[PDB]
Design a protein around this nucleic acid. Sequence first.
RNA 1: CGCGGGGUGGAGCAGCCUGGUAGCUCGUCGGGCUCAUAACCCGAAGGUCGUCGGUUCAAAUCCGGCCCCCGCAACCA
RNA 2: AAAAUGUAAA
RNA 3: ACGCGUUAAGCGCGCCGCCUGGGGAGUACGGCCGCAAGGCUGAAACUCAAAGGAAUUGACGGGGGCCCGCACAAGCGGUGGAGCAUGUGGUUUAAUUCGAAGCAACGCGAAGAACCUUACCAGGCCUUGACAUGCUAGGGAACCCGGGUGAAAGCCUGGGGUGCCCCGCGAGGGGAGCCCUAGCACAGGUGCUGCAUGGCCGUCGUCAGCUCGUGCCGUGAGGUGUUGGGUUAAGUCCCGCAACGAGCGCAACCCCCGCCGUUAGUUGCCAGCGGUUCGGCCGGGCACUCUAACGGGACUGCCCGCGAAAGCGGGAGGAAGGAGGGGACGACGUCUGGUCAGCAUGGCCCUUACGGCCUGGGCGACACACGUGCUACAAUGCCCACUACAAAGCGAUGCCACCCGGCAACGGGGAGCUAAUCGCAAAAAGGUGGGCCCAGUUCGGAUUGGGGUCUGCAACCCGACCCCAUGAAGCCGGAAUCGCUAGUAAUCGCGGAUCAGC
Lengths: 206, 60, 209
Amino acid sequence: GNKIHPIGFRLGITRDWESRWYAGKKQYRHLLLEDQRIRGLLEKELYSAGLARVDIERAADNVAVTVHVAKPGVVIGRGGERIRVLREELAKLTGKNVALNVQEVQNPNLSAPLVAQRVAEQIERRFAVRRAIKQAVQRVMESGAKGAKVIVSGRIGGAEQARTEWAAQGRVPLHTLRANIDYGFALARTTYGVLGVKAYIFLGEV
Amino acid sequence: ARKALIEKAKRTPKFKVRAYTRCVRCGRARSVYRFFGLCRICLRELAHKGQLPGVRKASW
Amino acid sequence: EIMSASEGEHGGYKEIIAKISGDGVYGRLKFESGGHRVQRVPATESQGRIHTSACTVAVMPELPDAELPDINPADLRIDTFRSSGAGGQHVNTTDSAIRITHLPTGIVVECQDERSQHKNKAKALSVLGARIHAAEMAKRQQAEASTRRNLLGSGDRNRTYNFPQGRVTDHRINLTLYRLDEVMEGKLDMLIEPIIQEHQADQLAALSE
RNA sequence: CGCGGGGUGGAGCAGCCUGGUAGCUCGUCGGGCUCAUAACCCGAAGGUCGUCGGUUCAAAUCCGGCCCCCGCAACCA
RNA sequence: AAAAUGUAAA
RNA sequence: ACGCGUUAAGCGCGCCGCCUGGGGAGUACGGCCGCAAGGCUGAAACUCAAAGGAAUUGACGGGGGCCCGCACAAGCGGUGGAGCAUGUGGUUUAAUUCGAAGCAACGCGAAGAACCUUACCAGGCCUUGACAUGCUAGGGAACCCGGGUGAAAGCCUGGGGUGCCCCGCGAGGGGAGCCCUAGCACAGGUGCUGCAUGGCCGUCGUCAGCUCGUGCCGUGAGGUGUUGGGUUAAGUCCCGCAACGAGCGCAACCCCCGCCGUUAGUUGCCAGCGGUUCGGCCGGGCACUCUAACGGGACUGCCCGCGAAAGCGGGAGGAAGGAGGGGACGACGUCUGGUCAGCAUGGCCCUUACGGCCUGGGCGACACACGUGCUACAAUGCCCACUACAAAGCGAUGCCACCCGGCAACGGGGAGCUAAUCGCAAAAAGGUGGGCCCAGUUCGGAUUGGGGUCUGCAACCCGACCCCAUGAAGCCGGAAUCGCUAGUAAUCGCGGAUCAGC
Ligand SMILES: [Mg+2]
Ligand SMILES: [Mg+2]
Ligand SMILES: [Mg+2]
Ligand SMILES: [Mg+2]
Ligand SMILES: [Mg+2]
Ligand SMILES: [Mg+2]
Ligand SMILES: [Mg+2]
Ligand SMILES: [Mg+2]
Ligand SMILES: [Mg+2]
Ligand SMILES: [Mg+2]
Ligand SMILES: [Mg+2]
Ligand SMILES: [Mg+2]
Ligand SMILES: [Mg+2]
Ligand SMILES: [Mg+2]
Ligand SMILES: [Mg+2]
Ligand SMILES: [Mg+2]
Ligand SMILES: [Mg+2]
Ligand SMILES: [Mg+2]
Ligand SMILES: [Mg+2]
Ligand SMILES: [Mg+2]
Ligand SMILES: [Mg+2]
Ligand SMILES: [Mg+2]
Ligand SMILES: [Mg+2]
Ligand SMILES: [Mg+2]
Ligand SMILES: [Mg+2]
Ligand SMILES: [Mg+2]
Ligand SMILES: [Mg+2]
Ligand SMILES: [Mg+2]
Ligand SMILES: [Mg+2]
Ligand SMILES: [Mg+2]
Ligand SMILES: [Mg+2]
Ligand SMILES: [Mg+2]
Ligand SMILES: [Mg+2]
Ligand SMILES: [Mg+2]
Ligand SMILES: [Mg+2]
Ligand SMILES: [Mg+2]
Ligand SMILES: [Mg+2]
Ligand SMILES: [Mg+2]
Ligand SMILES: [Mg+2]
Ligand SMILES: [Mg+2]
Ligand SMILES: [Mg+2]
Ligand SMILES: [Mg+2]
Ligand SMILES: [Mg+2]
Ligand SMILES: [Mg+2]
Ligand SMILES: [Mg+2]
Ligand SMILES: [Mg+2]
Ligand SMILES: [Mg+2]
Ligand SMILES: [Mg+2]
Ligand SMILES: [Mg+2]
Ligand SMILES: [Mg+2]
Ligand SMILES: [Mg+2]
Ligand SMILES: [Mg+2]
Ligand SMILES: [Mg+2]
Ligand SMILES: [Mg+2]
């Protein structure tokens, strides 16, 4: 075990912070604390919409959270309802301020943290792991990507003996900084235990 | 010593120095960076995600 | 205090005997006699495989011993008669030869070595002693080795020590407790006491049932 | 019993003739080498010399008794 | 020329 | 299959000899032969699920060729010896919590064990529980107060308020609700399994490797490509080639250091002027120094010689020349590696107890063994006083200038700074001056006595520092063994994370 987190490796180089705000010293900690609370309680409820990324930026008490999706019909709710009560549970826990603006990424198949979850779900639903992997990469490759690769690990198909498993089309130069590459994890829970899906999507150069 | 232990450090104790740090995410007692209230592991995790603003891998 | 103790290269003791002296010793070590299985990855492991092994142990109580206060004329039958072979007229008119019969066992020694009857009785009485001794030595061997064959035999009895499970499990009373560490340390009581108790529950349904 | 030799660190063997002085090999213990073991390398421990006595300023050494071990002898009838 | 060995469970 | 191939192992015929799983066994018995040794003929019981032929791919070699690494060598300083610091084995213990085990465990998880931390021990306790969402019987209100007892938890109790939905006139009711007593749901576990797992980490290894597609060869495993000549830190490139391509690696894209430029001019800086509270201090001003943001700069570009090329060797100009120095980056995989004790998680197990609380013990124990360490044995040294020259960080619950007392640890008093402003802050080696004279020493500072400062509820176990006295082992360390090739080794300080404190 030895590979580096692609994201942490490309900070301010090809990938921007999921949270953007200054602090100082005497306040940074509890700032991030509630900040982390947000993204987590967001993920728990907005899972149904399958979020690809939650952005958070702050101001003098003013706090903005620009959440992403590829199917926002769930976030927006009936006519425009669920989005309000959402923010109306937000300041119910921030004790500060509110924010909406839920923009939507075009191709969901070109978002890795999105992909993994849709795959990791197929796992829980007892699907062919070898097949779903090649299916995933196919759907990613045939939808414009310049590379792809998906890795799972754990008791594949409830095997007494756990093992690694993956496939890849195109190219995925994880060593190259100049390459913009998306990545995300998904935790495949099941009766036999916890698998784990990691998705690598190489979008292109820069 | 999981959910139970972490509780004591949250509430202010009998004496002054009796109060102690603990990760504000995993609840690890030992090695807690006070700047975040986080442990060295939780620190590395979220810093990798980008959830820790302005913090990038150092190199020189 | 150990007596015999052949080593074992690494580690052991391939065999070791020890006199554990005191009070209530045989009472709490009675049930050890038997085979003790061990399952773990041994020290000697060339790779990473768990290996089953075994060791028979035998507790024997203190045996008050006593050799017979040498012979006894009352149970000796001694015969004198004329020796055989050369000697001239002396050998012809001198019951110099000897024969002693040790009535209890049945072993007999003759002796017509030297010219004095007395000296021949001396030799015969000496060999007679030596021959009873080695008789009782053979007897105490066909008892000692045989009671070991008595206890230790074709039977997969007594406790099993599993390290990776961390659980000792005495097979006889089907008790098992996953606190092997403490056991392997010395506190054997919550293992020998449950046997001592179950054994007593047997003695209840003994002559009463 | 008649003569001779013998008993010294766990094993085997010097030292006794000539009093002052415990030595050799092996073993054991501690530290190296090696993945580990042995070999090898470095350092240490370990007996008051069978046993009672006597001689002496002083006894493993000399002298006497006993115990144990070993070989020799035990013939003429 | 140096230089023996590696029990038995995947 | 290897190979045989008019010297068949090809295609056919004639005839002889012989085989029918391995071991038993070319043994036994019988017969025949022999001087013998032994030969010829030649079985069975029993036993195993194989024995065996050729090929393939690796691995290994006390096999080979070519290369490479602080591996040897050439070096300089050390460990191993001493005293102490700490980790570990072991033993001890009511407990001395658990895990890590050759490299790749042993100043490792621990970047802060007096309580807490704490998972252990002892005792005193607690039961829908310290925690989460619920369903409720008495159906009570907040919230402060106090007594009681106690080592504290805990148990018990005196208060009192005269809180809020209801067109309630009304003594009385009617809901929400921190909440109080009893229930059922359920919580909880640092309990077990890294050999059920995720993630993340060490590792061979920054080693140059590993593979796919398709084509072709091969009955087939598989081979080819990836081999080969040259070249390189490199499966790096060039040429060649039944192979043609491609992916993950290598490289580069990023960071810091080296030179230069634009931009920027306070809180930083001062070259020339004025000033002149004896001096960036006043006015003054971005030139420099610096700060930090964008840039230029190097491409085997030029020259020489070799070379088919790739590129190798030398020269020039240049702050820097063939990867300039350093970091970030760790391929397919390997170690049944590590970690259920950071968290997560399947299964298993505990349920007035394997859960929870408190006080006090332990994690610091001590016949010994090991790792890593710090201080030393001194004269290239040590002590004392004066005087210098850093970089990178920390600091409105903190840093503490500055006075004041103290021999000092420090305590009063107090200015400034949320800081390129103020402060931690004296850098220490160094220079100069003075003493010491080869000695267990003015070396060494272990150990111990006595006396105090600080932090904390509280320093007995069990803290750090100051003063006095004590002044041990050690006079260069056996066998053995480690680091590092340039601003490196050795040596000299400083800062920080942790953190009341150490
Ligand atoms: Mg994302
Ligand atoms: Mg507990
Ligand atoms: Mg608190
Ligand atoms: Mg504390
Ligand atoms: Mg033996
Ligand atoms: Mg024997
Ligand atoms: Mg007669
Ligand atoms: Mg009879
Ligand atoms: Mg123990
Ligand atoms: Mg001897
Ligand atoms: Mg060896
Ligand atoms: Mg001794
Ligand atoms: Mg002795
Ligand atoms: Mg005497
Ligand atoms: Mg004497
Ligand atoms: Mg006499
Ligand atoms: Mg052998
Ligand atoms: Mg082995
Ligand atoms: Mg031919
Ligand atoms: Mg021929
Ligand atoms: Mg056969
Ligand atoms: Mg045959
Ligand atoms: Mg024959
Ligand atoms: Mg025959
Ligand atoms: Mg014959
Ligand atoms: Mg012969
Ligand atoms: Mg023959
Ligand atoms: Mg090479
Ligand atoms: Mg060398
Ligand atoms: Mg000390
Ligand atoms: Mg105990
Ligand atoms: Mg009270
Ligand atoms: Mg009241
Ligand atoms: Mg390299
Ligand atoms: Mg072939
Ligand atoms: Mg063919
Ligand atoms: Mg190949
Ligand atoms: Mg060739
Ligand atoms: Mg290549
Ligand atoms: Mg710098
Ligand atoms: Mg001037
Ligand atoms: Mg003037
Ligand atoms: Mg540039
Ligand atoms: Mg040059
Ligand atoms: Mg070159
Ligand atoms: Mg394997
Ligand atoms: Mg020191
Ligand atoms: Mg003063
Ligand atoms: Mg003063
Ligand atoms: Mg003050
Ligand atoms: Mg100000
Ligand atoms: Mg000087
Ligand atoms: Mg002291
Ligand atoms: Mg000297």
